[PDB]
Design an enzyme around this catalytic site. Structure first.
Site, PDB file in Angstrom:
ATOM      1  N   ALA A  33       0.833  -1.193   0.000  1.00  0.00           N
ATOM      2  CA  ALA A  33       0.000   0.000   0.000  1.00  0.00           C
ATOM      3  C   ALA A  33       0.871   1.248   0.000  1.00  0.00           C
ATOM      4  CB  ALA A  33      -0.926   0.000   1.214  1.00  0.00           C
ATOM      5  N   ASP A  34       0.645   2.121  -0.974  1.00  0.00           N
ATOM      6  CA  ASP A  34       1.407   3.347  -1.124  1.00  0.00           C
ATOM      7  C   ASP A  34       0.677   4.494  -0.418  1.00  0.00           C
ATOM      8  OD1 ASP A  34      -0.725   3.618  -2.803  1.00  0.00           O
ATOM      9  OD2 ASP A  34       0.437   3.810  -4.653  1.00  0.00           O
ATOM     10  N   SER A  35       1.131   5.723  -0.656  1.00  0.00           N
ATOM     11  CA  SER A  35       0.643   6.909   0.036  1.00  0.00           C
ATOM     12  C   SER A  35      -0.881   6.965   0.111  1.00  0.00           C
ATOM     13  CB  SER A  35       1.186   8.146  -0.678  1.00  0.00           C
ATOM     14  OG  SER A  35       0.720   9.350  -0.101  1.00  0.00           O
TER      15      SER A  35
END
Lengths: 72, 50, 50, 79
Positions: A33-35
């Protein structure tokens, strides 16, 4: 329960397998999971338990274990 | 040889370009709606906290 | 004045709650597409930032 | 007007079927022979009237097919 409602939220907000999401599974490196994905994950965690979290204390949360620790 | 290959190429290119035009547009539409509502939510969050 | 502004704060709070629910609902659906587009179709071809 | 080829058949298709190469080719094709780039005469002929031939053979419930490598052949349907 809380310790499995957290998994319910994490798996369905990141799309990763239930087996993948262990207590120590970090979101960014393990779950990917990114930003924005992590932002949505924290929002969903807030919604599930109908609570609110501070910005800094929330951003400090970067793992399943930390997620539950702040949740429980 | 030319007559063969040129044809083949034309069909390849046309399908590729039209299919990507057809799909990517709506994919980006969805992504943009999600981006927009997230941005509105963050602005509301920050203003509420302050 | 602070009381009067707190009423605005509460309006913003209700708005923020509504937006929060809507954003989460969008993400839930979008997840399926993400798992489905792991075929290397998304990296450049589908996600044309232009 | 009446008594005019277009009433019954496209001009290009009739033009193809009237060619001197057609009987040979037809015979061969039906027998299962594949047509590549080396037999120029045949190949060129095929290329020139592709769609007419396809449409024609369709009457038989058979597909006249063109592989990516540039070779023609016949694929029969279940019917």
């Amino acid at each position: 329960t809380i310790e499995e409602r957290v998994k319910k939220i994490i798996g369905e907000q990141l799309g990763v397998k239930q087996e993948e999401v262990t207590n120590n599974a970090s979101f960014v490196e393990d779950l990917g999971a990114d930003s924005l994905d992590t932002v949505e994950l924290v929002m969903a965690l807030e919604e599930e338990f109908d609570t609110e979290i501070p910005d800094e204390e929330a951003e400090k949360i970067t793992t399943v274990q930390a997620a539950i620790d702040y949740i429980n | 040889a030319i007559r063969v290959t040129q044809s083949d190429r034309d069909l390849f290119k046309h399908l590729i370009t039209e299919a990507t035009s057809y799909v990517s547009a709506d994919y980006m539409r969805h992504a943009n709606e999600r981006r927009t509502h997230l941005d509105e939510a963050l602005a509301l969050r920050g203003e509420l906290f302050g | 004045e602070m009381e009067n502004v707190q009423k605005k704060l509460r309006k913003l709070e209700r708005d923020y709650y509504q937006i929060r629910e809507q954003v989460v609902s969008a993400k839930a659906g979008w997840c399926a597409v993400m798992r489905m587009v792991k075929d290397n179709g998304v990296e450049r071809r589908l996600h044309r930032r232009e | 007007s009446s008594t005019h080829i277009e009433q019954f058949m496209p001009v290009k298709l009739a033009q193809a079927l009237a060619n001197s190469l057609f009987p040979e080719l037809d015979s061969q094709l039906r027998a299962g022979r594949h047509i590549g780039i080396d037999d120029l005469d045949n190949h060129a002929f095929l290329m020139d009237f592709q769609e007419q031939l396809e449409e024609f053979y369709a009457r038989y419930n058979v597909e006249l097919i063109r592989a990516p490598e540039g070779f023609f052949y016949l694929r029969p349907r279940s019917t």
